Every structure is written in C-alpha cells, then in structure tokens.
Amino acid sequence: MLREFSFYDVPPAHVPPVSEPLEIACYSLSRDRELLLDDSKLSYYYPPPLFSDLNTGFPNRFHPPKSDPDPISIVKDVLMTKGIQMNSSFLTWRGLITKIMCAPLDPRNHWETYLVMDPTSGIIMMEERTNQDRMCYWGYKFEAISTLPEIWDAQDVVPDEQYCSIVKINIGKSKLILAGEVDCIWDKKPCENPNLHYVELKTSKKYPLENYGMRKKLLKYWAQSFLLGIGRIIIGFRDDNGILIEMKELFTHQIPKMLRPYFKPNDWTPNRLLVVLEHALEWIKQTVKQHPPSTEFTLSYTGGSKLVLRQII
Ligand SMILES: [Mg+2]
C-alpha cells in the first residue's frame, strides 16, 4: 500500500514545542571508519589563517570518505553496548530528519529512506540503503584546518575520522533519538549538556541575505544544527579560487532571527518547517503502526510537494 503526505495540506497550527537536545552517548570513528567508544576524535575549534587555500592537498592528501550509507543498527549497538535505554518513537541519523524537514525547501534533492518498527522496542528505525570532487574537498579542508585534536590528554584530509553525538530530542508528540557527526567543540566538553558547546563548520560563497538561494542554504544550515542542539555554525566564506576570505560565527538560534527581515510572502520559515515536520512525523508513526512490527517501508521524496510511504511487500 501507498500513503501520501502533502506539505501544503498541513493546517495552520502553532509551532510544536521542541525540547533541548540531550546527549545520551557519543563515539568516535577512526580513519579506517572503525568505531571507537571514546571521544578520542573530538577536536577543538581554532580559527584558521585568513587566505588559507582550501585546494591545498587535493587530491593527493585527500582520502575520500565511505560512499555507502551506514546502517542505523550501529547507533543501536552503541547504546546497547553502553547499556543505555531506548524509549523513543524514532531512531535514526540526524541527516535523515533534516531531509524530511527541509523537503519543502529543495524540490531538487530527491531521496529515499527505509523504515522498520523493531518488534522488541517498538521504535521506528530509519536508514538509507542505496563526495570526492574539489568543492567537497574545500569543505573537508576547511574542517581540517579549523580544528585542533585533543593533545594534552591524548596534513591528510580524512573525513572518515570523526566524532558523533547521540541525542534525545522531542518534537511535539514525537520522541527521537538522533545520531550526527559533530565537527568540533568550542571549548572543553563539560565532562552539563555538551551540545551548545558543539560547533558546525561550513564553507560557502557569500551572498546578501536578499538572495533567495543564500536564505535557503542558511535555513538548511539552521535545521541540521537545530536537530542536534549544536550552538554555533561557523562559516568560512571563500572566493571562486577556493581561498578563505572571511569567517562568520553564528549562533544557531540567531539564524531565524537574522532572516526575519528578508522572508518574502509564502517563503518557508523556520516555524512553518517545524509545524510540517511534526505533522510528517505523526503521519509516519500512525501509518507504520497500522502494520505488524518488522514491516519494511520506503519513505520517498521525488519532487512535487509530497512524501510517499510505500509498504515493501
Ligand atoms: Mg561541517
């Protein structure tokens, strides 16, 4: 069977309450993508030199990251190994909620996720089952030059090596456990919820906020970081040569405030994106629960203004 959810059919409701995302676990990945149950790979933000060349090391010092998606079983394994209870509606990768949330924003980004309700936990688990160009490298290079590893208590661009935060976040009536890569931390991790100390690093050409493309890009920056409770998004603005010309430190909560003067009528706004997401998540829950556990579904966005949930029979 087929179910549809239309973005524009969502009733005009108040923005759902969203809890402060609470870290329940973290882990690291080695350069060979090996899971490590520690923060050996959490690094610190330190501003890189202005006019750094983001082409340096491409492609000979570049080790492109794994192309295939990771199974969500990993996060479950991690939590099980640590003896952490999982009591939520959803378990997935932050990035897959970003896709649902931002679907109304980029009709060109088509995607497909797999969902199954676990027969023991009753949690809906979501994953993908189906990268190395110069532009991508600019982003990875900016992350590499902007970060300092732990040294006191412990160049090749190897994006496989990373640190990850697993969070509980509630969006209205939906409880989610989300795992996502954290680029670095602003200062020492409170050994206090750590997430507002976390930093996301981005590289972009700078456009005025008048520019629709720029606003949309910022909205997606905001959405991604909002879902993991990240406090800061730091943008390395680059020119067409890939030279770092300016850095801009933003607080995540400031992006919607900063964008307020520039939204044209009928623009998707942070508040509207949250309303639609809550309704999307509620729809997914009710649909999945019309079937026995271990029923596999595909959730698809293939342009237009609808999500499609398909039972795999
Ligand atoms: Mg980043």
Curated annotation (Swiss-Prot):
EC number(s) on file: 3.6.1.-
Catalyzed reactions per annotation: a 5'-end NAD(+)-phospho-ribonucleoside in mRNA + H2O = a 5'-end phospho-ribonucleoside in mRNA + NAD(+) + H(+); a 5'-end (N(7)-methyl 5'-triphosphoguanosine)-ribonucleoside-ribonucleotide in mRNA + H2O = a (N(7)-methyl 5'-triphosphoguanosine)-nucleoside + a 5'-end phospho-ribonucleoside in mRNA + H(+); a 5'-end triphospho-ribonucleoside in mRNA + H2O = a 5'-end phospho-ribonucleoside in mRNA + diphosphate + H(+)
Compartments, as annotated in UniProt: Nucleus
Top-level enzyme category: hydrolase
Consequence recorded when altering residue 217 to A: No detrimental effect on pyrophosphohydrolase activity, dhp1/Rat1 interaction or stimulation of dhp1/Rat1 mediated RNA degradation
Domain of life: Eukaryota
Residues the record lists as binding substrate: 33, 93-95, 164, 181, 202, 224
Cofactor note: Divalent metal cation.
This protein's GO CC annotations: cytosol; Las1 complex; nucleus
Molecular function terms from GO: 5'-hydroxyl dinucleotide hydrolase activity; GDP binding; metal ion binding; mRNA 5'-diphosphatase activity; phosphodiesterase decapping endonuclease activity; RNA binding; RNA NAD+-cap (NAD+-forming) hydrolase activity
Pfam family for this entry, one: RAI1
Coiled coil: none
Binding annotation for a divalent metal cation: 143, 183, 200-201
Cofactor(s) demanded: a divalent metal cation
BP-aspect Gene Ontology terms: cleavage in ITS2 between 5.8S rRNA and LSU-rRNA of tricistronic rRNA transcript (SSU-rRNA, 5.8S rRNA, LSU-rRNA); mRNA processing; NAD-cap decapping; nuclear-transcribed mRNA catabolic process
Subunit annotation: Interacts with dhp1/Rat1; the interaction is direct, stabilizes dhp1 protein structure and stimulates its exoribonuclease activity. The interaction also stimulates din1 pyrophosphohydrolase activity, probably by recruiting it to mRNA substrates.
Similarity remark: Belongs to the DXO/Dom3Z family.
Function: Decapping enzyme for NAD-capped RNAs: specifically hydrolyzes the nicotinamide adenine dinucleotide (NAD) cap from a subset of RNAs by removing the entire NAD moiety from the 5'-end of an NAD-capped RNA. The NAD-cap is present at the 5'-end of some RNAs and snoRNAs. In contrast to the canonical 5'-end N7 methylguanosine (m7G) cap, the NAD cap promotes mRNA decay. Also acts as a non-canonical decapping enzyme that removes the entire cap structure of m7G capped or incompletely capped RNAs and mediates their subsequent degradation.
Identification of the protein by name: Decapping nuclease din1
Source species of the chain: Schizosaccharomyces pombe (strain 972 / ATCC 24843)
